[PDB]
Amino acid sequence: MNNYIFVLSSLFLVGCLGLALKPSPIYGGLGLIVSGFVGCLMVLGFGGSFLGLMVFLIYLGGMLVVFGYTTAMATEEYPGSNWLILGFLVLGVIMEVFLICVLNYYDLGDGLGDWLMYEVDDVGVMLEGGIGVAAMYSCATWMMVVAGWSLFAGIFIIIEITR
Amino acid sequence: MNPITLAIIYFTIFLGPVITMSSTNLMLMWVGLEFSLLAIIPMLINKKNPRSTEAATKYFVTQATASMIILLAIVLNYKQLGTWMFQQQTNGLILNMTLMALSMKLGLAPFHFWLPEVTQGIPLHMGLILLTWQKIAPLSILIQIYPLLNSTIILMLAITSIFMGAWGGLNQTQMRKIMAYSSIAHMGWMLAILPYNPSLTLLNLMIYIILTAPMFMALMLNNSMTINSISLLWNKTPAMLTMISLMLLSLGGLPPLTGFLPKWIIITELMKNNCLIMATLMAMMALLNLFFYTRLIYSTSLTMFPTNNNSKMMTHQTKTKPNLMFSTLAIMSTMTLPLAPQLI
Amino acid sequence: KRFFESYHEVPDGTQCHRKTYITTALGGICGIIGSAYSVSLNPADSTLEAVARVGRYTFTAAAIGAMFGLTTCVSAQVREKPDDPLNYFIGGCAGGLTLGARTHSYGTAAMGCVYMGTAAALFKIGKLEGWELFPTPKV
Amino acid sequence: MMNGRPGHEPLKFLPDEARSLPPPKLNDPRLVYMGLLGYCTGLMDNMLRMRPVMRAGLHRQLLFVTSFVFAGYFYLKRQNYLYAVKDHDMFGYIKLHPEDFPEKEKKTYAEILEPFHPVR
Amino acid sequence: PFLDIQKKLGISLDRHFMFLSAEQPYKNAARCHAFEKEWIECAHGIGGTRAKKECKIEFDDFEECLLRYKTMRRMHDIKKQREKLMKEGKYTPPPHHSGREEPRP
Amino acid sequence: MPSTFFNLTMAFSLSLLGTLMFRSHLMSTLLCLEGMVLSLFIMTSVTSLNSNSMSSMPIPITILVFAACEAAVGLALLVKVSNTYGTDYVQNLNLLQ
Amino acid sequence: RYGLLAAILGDKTTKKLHEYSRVITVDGNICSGKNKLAKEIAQQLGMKHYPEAGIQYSSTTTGDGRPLDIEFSGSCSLEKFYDDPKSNDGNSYRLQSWLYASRLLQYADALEHLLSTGQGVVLERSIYSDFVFLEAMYNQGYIRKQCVDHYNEIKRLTLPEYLPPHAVIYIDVPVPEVQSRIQKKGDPHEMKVTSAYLQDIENAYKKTFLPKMSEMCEVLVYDSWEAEDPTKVVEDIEYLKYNKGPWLKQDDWTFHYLRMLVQDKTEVLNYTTIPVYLPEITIGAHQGSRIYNSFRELPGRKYAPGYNAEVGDKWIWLK
Amino acid sequence: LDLIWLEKTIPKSTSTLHTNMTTLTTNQKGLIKLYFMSFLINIILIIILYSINL
Ligand SMILES: CCCCCCCCCCCCCCCCCC(=O)OC[C@H](COP(=O)(O)OCCN)OC(=O)CCCCCCCCCCCCCCCCC
Ligand SMILES: Nc1ncnc2c1ncn2[C@@H]1O[C@H](COP(=O)(O)OP(=O)(O)O)[C@@H](O)[C@H]1O
């Protein structure tokens, strides 16, 4: 539809509300994995195939998975029934509708119109994300170096903490 | 620490503030802040004592959420101006976020709860770095953006800090926390003049660094985290009793010593700008800070507390000396006042 | 916000009702904020206990707000002199006294009276002399 | 403040323009103070390290009195410049924007009538 | 910035990409490349305090090249109007809405 | 986008309220903390994409790379805590009082 | 002095360690002819034999090494310990606290020799074994309960940092036979000591010291007869396998920090001076100032080693 | 008037006013949740301080 993004945006807020009610450590991981799926989709909507898939590849299964992993190792003591949380969550599901509603009557609005892909070359190539992300190696080679040191000194920071 | 790791970490703890200061693309300023967060956490848990893990886990959560808030400000700006950096046009709320966030990393005012607690569980050494080479980074970001921040908020965080710092300090007896509290206070003065004359913030900082760095290397010379512990200074090492006395009164604003200049010129600049309401209240409770400074003076110098018999044993053995920095930073700090005009 | 400001617009000693209402609100607002910090830190034992504390702090603060407003307005009315720090001091004097009572302490009333009244008086002077608080940088 | 000035040297200590200013006399009271400030640092060090206060490190005493002083001449040389820039900048503005800083005529007391409060 | 080790060293690791009009890869100019230029060649040599009042035409425009909100209000208003009229049939879906009208290359 | 950009921003505030209102397990917090980084990553990517500002796409990822390590440090502290107490409840972290 | 510079450039303890390089303590009752065994074992493996810690062991350690006056050395008398048990002034606790500080200095000096030269260490009784005297003292009226807590607090604060004895030797002779051993040695203060107090000392070892250390280190129990036969005991030490114990994890980069600690005596006993004010331990400001303002005026002590001209130091004007 | 009334009013009272104020501000659980919430309150008030003085 035209509200291709809004609906999704709404789902992203629902997942964030789930993480915010701080549900059981791994039941909510799912929540993230859900909104990460959702955010992966929105970016794709705007044409960021690479940037999008990237999230589905790194935060989704790399970061998040490792997160729950550790949950299992510790902090998954799985000792308030999440169902109570789901009860509240349901409240917010529509409570947010309230927040939107005021501005809904106030109304941009009426779903989502041309509030996406503002300008795109009706002709032409090389217009695609991943050409921009690959500026790490031409004209933006300082972001690349500092990220390196993050991960690189990350190794040394982690082991030192672990030890 | 495998000396290699020591190098990588220390480099990061030092590349962290330096990238922040040098770059203009805010993003690069954010990652400078991010590195500092990552580099400091390993050192904080070096003893790995149960208190330490608590310290780092607090420092990290407080630092991390603030880092995320600073990033949100940069992300929002990017959509209100394509630029990756704050400009005259910036929405006021965008800047206020940056003030709150950066005032959390620096630990000013109503966000002053983490610092006293992390200063209590970390070693005296890493205490210094956590107090003085980690304040340079955020302050740089603020000083750069001063023209745009709000005069009202800063002042409120300034005044609050002064009060919280002072009041907190009065009760504390642990030295690490007395210093943590002082830093909150001095940090307050610094952020008070930022909107008006940033150049004075950089003086009220250096002087704080030239005052606190000698003070802590003094606390650790005898590694005393208690006033009772520093009070037996007269037996362990008598000479530092004289300068410890002046440096602490210098940390508070008493007039002959170097410490008056930062307060004096900040008050002169605020009165020049007409805040004779705000400046007056700050100076007054600033006087509360000296009370707890002098109470320590009493215990350590003006009165001689009783010592244990084993203290004679520690005297016998040659006392490992205090680095030269102590002297050069004790004198340049206790008495440079005759040279104020050129400092400002 | 156009509201609170109204307090200042009408000459002092006049329209006490509005004055007292506004002053009462400010105190009450402070009450809420104060209770909030008091509950967030130094938490309570039961939700109700804390709801009570919020109430206690709110009312006490609302009271100090009212008497300040009422006393200052009336003192000015009865005295017929609209511009006088003394009006406010009497008001602040009273406000402190309410705080003292709520805290059931004559001593607090002492410090309360002096300190609180002095502060309020200074507010009057501040307004009379056009003192500027939290000023914009004009260097 | 003074940063953002035209021609600002982005990272330089003292721009050559500061050559035009007189050099600080080596015996300027201030540099001499820095000297004493230094000697004291030295003496203090000896004391904290428990050495004969004055008769020890006579080499160090020199390093100190001579490090501080060296620093001074080159610092004061700059701070002097900074202040000098301040006038160049200040005086210039007074002129470029003359109307805002107008010369005022002060009536001889004969004319002005300040009221007289008697002490009695 | 606070310590300009970049200008001094002449390096430009952080300045080349701060605004939308900076060199975009493959010279694919972004939206507004026109305005931001007009709003920063204006505010060059004039400090901010005076890049904020007189160079307000170029920001008021660049604030609408990118937010593109005043447009919305126009279009959204237009939309409503159509709706009301159409409901009473006052207005009919244009030939465009009817499609055809010779969609051409 | 203007509409959506709101949802993401409130997502970040709902994630903000989460990390500033702890409850038992820390791993929940760190998890919440990450919810923000996702919201920031999504918003940065979205505007960069509709501004056709390709010179800035590097950032959306630099944000994630730094955020990942940031989280790595966070979890190692967490593992350190349930090794010293073994229950990972923000509740026992009070020795420093 | 040793520093990370030295560690970075060679100077690693690991490459200086050899089989004969261990921390071996021999502990016994007041009279176990322990001294001989140690010097004997020492002679066997060339181990630096450290003598039993003394009141003036620290003074022999520092500067001139001439014995200090009693008040300069903390005013402790083992002699008065015995003739006046449960004394009003508490010389017995002050004696014990100074003794713990002395062995802390001795153990640290021993570890410094071990990690630097690599020669193994024999120090007789250790800090770990010191507690038996206090346990027995509290068992009788010698020390009160808090006094015990103050020693335990100092022990908990300082002893864990130092690595455990590699092996411990136990030269045991029965409660009655040590008292006859006491009877013939000449001092009269050692004589007339409580049989029950000696009972409490050896009992405290058997009940607590040997089992505790039986995992932390290779305890080698020896009866008197095995003793007086250094050869046999020495043989057995060379026989035990130095495996079980915390010493296994001491990598070079870990030893460096331990070395830098023992290298700093002022820290070794930093927690020995903790400001806990039990009455026996307290110097007192007026007496303490006089004792310090007097100890500091002794020749060669006024200034740091190398700088006091009284004893003949020179080159002070360039040091 | 000397001793008690002129020492209880000016010199001593100021002693007490503060002493009591430090006792309330420094009696903190040390728990992170409490402290953090207070950060929440602050964000809220500052959000408003900007809002009302828009
Ligand atoms: C503007 C004026 C500001 C105030 C100036 C006057 C106050 C100076 C600061 C004093 C602060 C400490 C007060 C208490 C000190 C106690 C000292 C003490 O207890 O004695 C021991 C101490 C160290 O001993 P040691 O030198 O090792 O040998 C003796 C061993 N018993 O013995 C020592 O420490 C000896 C060395 C002490 C320091 C000497 C300082 C002399 C006075 C300096 C006056 C400066 C006046 C400047 C005037 C400027 C005018 C413009
Ligand atoms: N902690 C202590 N408290 C009291 N006395 C101690 C303590 N440690 C050692 N001693 C004294 O050491 C003496 C035993 O030493 P001894 O066996 O004579 O030395 P050697 O090894 O030269 O034979 C005992 O008489 C005992 O009083």
Q: Taking CB atoms and an 8 Å limit, are E76 and A131 in contact across chains? A: no
Task: Name the residue facing F51 among E25, E66, E72 (closest C-beta).
Answer: E66
Query: Of B199, B280, E46, D99, which Cα lies nearest the Cα of C139?
Result: B199
Distance from CA of H3 to the nearest CA of C (A): 18
Residues with CB under 6 A from ligand 1: B 238-239, 241-242, 245-246, 256, 301; D 47; G 293
Structure tokens at A84: 């109570």
H-helix segments, B23-135 = 26-44, 50-80, 92-105, 114-121, 124-132
The SS3 call for residue E86 is helix
Task: Give how far B170 is from chain D: nearest CA, Å.
Answer: 29
- How far CA A39 is from CA of A7, A35, A60, F48, G209, in Å, comes to 12, 6, 10, 15, 65
Measured CA to CA, the distance from residue F34 to residue G68 in angstroms comes to 65
Q: Residue F17, class by beta-carbon neighbours within 10 Å (0-12 exposed, 13-18 middle, 19+ buried)?
A: middle
For B20, the token pair is 């922040």
Contact G316 D59 (CB under 8 A): no
Other C-beta atoms within 10 Å of H23: how many? 12
- Please state the length of chain B: 344
Task: Output the CA torsion B279→B285→B291→B294 (10° steps).
Answer: -30
d(C-alpha D72, C-alpha G154), whole Å: 50
Q: Any contact of C with E, at least 3 CB pairs below 8 A? A: no
> What residues have CB less than 8 Å from D111, skipping those under 6 apart?
none
Nearest to G74 by CA among G52, G53, G96: G96
Q: Residue F69 is encoded by which pair of tokens?
A: 């390590």
Residues near E21 by beta carbon (within 8 Å), at least 6 away in sequence:
B82, E29, E30, E32, E33, E36, E37, E40
Q: Do F2 and E72 touch (CB under 8 A)?
A: yes
Nearest CA to CA, how far is E88 from chain A (Å)? 20
Residue D85, domain member (yes or no): yes
Out of F4, F26, F69, the one facing A150 most closely (by C-beta) is: F69
CA D69 – CA D64 distance, rounded (Å):
8
Contacts of A19 (CB under 8 A, 6+ apart): A28, A31, A32, A35, F15, F18, F31, F32, F35
C132 touches chain B (CB under 8 A): yes
Closest partner residue to F96 (CB to CB) among H30, H36, H39 is H30
Report yes or no: D64 and B324 within 8 Å, Cβ to Cβ: no
Q: Which residues of F touch B82 (CB under 8 A)?
A: 51, 53
- The DSSP secondary-structure symbol of F30 reads H
Is residue D78 within 8 A of residue B343, CB to CB? The reply is no
Instruction: Say how far apart CA G35 and CA G12 lie, in whole Å.
Output: 32
Contacts of D69 (CB under 8 A, 6+ apart): D31, D34, D35, D38
In whole angstroms, give the CA distance from residue F67 to residue F63.
6
| Number of residues in chain F | 97
D93 belongs to a structural domain: yes
Query: Which of G41, G76, G78, G140 for a ligand 2 pocket mutation test, highest count of atoms within 8 Å of Cβ?
Result: G78
Indicate which atom in ligand 2 lies nearest the CA of residue G99.
Answer: 1
Q: Which residues, other chains included, contact A108 with Cβ-Cβ below 8 Å and sequence gap of 6+?
A: A115, E72, E76, F2, F3
Q: Which of A147, B137, A137 is nearest to F66 (CA)?
A: A147
- Sequence-distant (6+) residues with CB within 8 A of E29 are E21, F52
Q: How far apart are CA A154 and CA B5, in angstroms?
A: 11
Q: CA B232, CA G273: separation in Å to the nearest integer?
A: 9
A40 vs B280: CA distance, rounded Å: 55
The count of CB pairs under 8 A between chains A and F is 214
What distance in Å separates residue B94's CA from the closest CA in chain C?
19
Q: Which residues constitute the domain of residue D76?
A: 1-97
List of chain A residues whose C-beta atoms are within 8 Å of the C-beta of residue E13: 141-142
Q: What count of other Cβ atoms lies within 10 Å of the Cβ of residue G139?
A: 16
CB atoms under 10 Å from CB of G77, counted, come to 17
Q: Which residues of F touch E20 (CB under 8 A)?
A: 51, 53
Cβ atoms of E47 and D4 closer than 8 Å? yes
Contacts of G82 (CB under 8 A, 6+ apart): G189, G190, G192, G193
Instruction: With beta carbons less than 8 A apart as the criterion, state whether G301 and G39 touch.
Output: no
Query: What span, in angstroms and rounded, lies between the C-alpha atoms of B247 and B230?
Result: 14
The closest CB to that of E1, out of B24, B88, B89, belongs to B24
CA gap A88, A92 in Å, rounded: 6
Q: Which of E17, E31, E72 is opposite residue F55, by nearest beta carbon?
A: E17
G202 contacts: CB under 8 Å, gap ≥ 6: G29, G132, G172, G174, G175
- The domain locations on chain H are 1-54
| Ligand 2 contact via G190 beta carbon (within 6 Å) | yes
Query: DSSP state, B224?
Result: -
Sign of CA dihedral G76, G77, G81, G86: negative
| CB atoms E28 and A126 under 8 Å | yes
Chains that touch F (3 or more CB pairs under 8 A): A, B, E, H
Q: Which of G2, G6, G22 is nearest to G250 (CA)?
A: G22
Which pair of tokens denotes residue B182?
């002082």
- Quick check: A95 contacting F, CB < 8 Å? no
Nearest ligand, CA of residue G28? 2
Q: How many CB atoms lie within 10 A of CB G156?
A: 10
Give me the residue label for tokens 């050899």.
Answer: G18
End-to-end C-alpha distance for chain G, whole angstroms: 16
Structure tokens given for G196: 């029950």
Q: Residue G30 C-alpha to ligand 2 middle, in angstroms? A: 5
Contact B316 G75 (CB under 8 A): no
Q: At residue G258, what is the residue type? A: L
CA distance D65 to chain G (A): 15
F57, A129 contact by CB (below 8 A): yes
Residue D108 inside a domain? The answer is no
Instruction: Give the ligand with the smallest distance to the CA of B330.
Output: 1
Handedness of CA D102, D107, D112, D118 (dihedral sign): positive
Q: With H, G, I as helix, E, B as strand and everything else as coil, classify residue G28.
A: strand
Question: Distance between CA G108 and CA G106 in Å, rounded?
Answer: 5
Query: Cβ of F3 and A67 within 8 Å?
Result: no
Backbone angles phi and psi of G276, in degrees to 5: -100, 120
Residue of chain A with shortest Cα separation from B23 = A142
**Cα–Cα distances in Å, from G220 out to D106, F34, G28, G31, G51?**
105, 57, 12, 18, 20
- Beta-carbon count within 10 A of B192 CB: 29
Give the integer Cα–Cα distance in Å for C45 and C50: 7
The method recorded for this entry reads cryo-EM
G38 Cβ partners below 8 Å, 6+ apart? G26, G49, G122, G123, G124
In a domain, D119, yes or no: no
Residue among F27, F49, F58 minimizing CB distance to A136: F58
Q: Which residues of A36-56 are buried (b: 16+ CB within 10 A; e: fewer)?
A: bbbbbbbbbbbbbebbbbbbb
Give me the DSSP letters along D29-73. HHHHHHHHHHHHHHHHHHHHTTS-TTTS-HHHHHHHHHHHHHHHH
How far apart, in whole angstroms, are the C-alpha atoms of residue C68 and residue C117? Answer: 9
Cβ of E25 within 8 Å of Cβ of F53? The answer is no
Rg (CA), chain H: 19
Ligand 2 centre to CA of B54 (Å) is 44
3-state SS, residue G222? strand
Closest to B78 in 3D by CA, of F56, G275, G260: F56
* DSSP string across A11-62: HHHHHHHHHHT---HHHHHHHHHHHHHHHHHHHHHTT-HHHHHHHHHHIIII
Contact H22 B113 (CB under 8 A): no
The structure tokens listed for C68 are 């300040």
Q: Quick check: B200 and B265 in contact, CB under 8 A?
A: yes
- 8-state DSSP, G206: I
**For chain C, how many residues are written?**
139
CA of B242 to the centre of ligand 1 (A): 6
Q: What angle do helix axes G91-116 and G145-158 make, rounded to 10 degrees?
A: 10
- Does ligand 2 come within 6 angstroms of the Cβ of G313? no
The 3-state secondary structure of chain C reads: CHHHHHHHHCCCCCCHHHHHHHHHHHHHHHHHHHHHHHHHCCCCCCHHHHHHHHHHHHHHHHHHHHHHHHHHHHHHHHHCCCCCHHHHHHHHHHHHHHHHHHCCCHHHHHHHHHHHHHHHHHHHHHHHHCCCCCCCCCC
The alpha carbon of B300 and the centre of ligand 1 are apart by a number of angstroms equal to: 14
The two tokens of residue B207 are 């002087």
Distance G35 CA to ligand 2 centre (A): 10
Q: How far apart are CA F97 and CA F80, in angstroms?
A: 20
Q: What is the DSSP letter of B298?
A: I
Find residue B109's DSSP bridge partners: none
How far apart, in Å, are the Cα atoms of B151 and each of B155, C2, H50? 6, 22, 11
Give burial (CB, 10 Å; 0-12/13-18/19+) of G165. Answer: buried
The amino acid at G87: S
Count: domains in chain F: 1
Which amino acid would we find at residue E75? M
- Identify the domain containing residue F17 by its residue range: 2-97
Q: Which residue is associated with the tokens 């010199």?
A: H11
Q: How far is CA F89 from the centre of its chain?
A: 19
Query: Residues 6 or more apart from G231 whose CB is under 8 A from it?
Result: G40, G44
How far does CA B236 lie from the centroid of its chain? Answer: 28
Q: Are B39 and B13 in contact (CB under 8 A)?
A: yes
Structure token digits, residue F94 = 């009070």
The Cα–Cα gap between A43 and F46 comes to 6
Contact F87 A22 (CB under 8 A): no
Contact list, F81 vs chain B (CB under 8 Å): 53-54, 57
Please give the resolution of this entry in Å, rounded to 1 decimal.
3.3
Distance CA C90, CA C80 (A): 14
Number of other residues whose CB lies within 10 A of the CB of residue B144: 20
Least Cα distance to G159 among G115, G208, G107 occurs for G107
Task: From A78, A96, A62, select the one nearest A27 (Cα to Cα).
Answer: A78
Between helices A49-58 and F26-50, what is the axis angle to 10°? 170
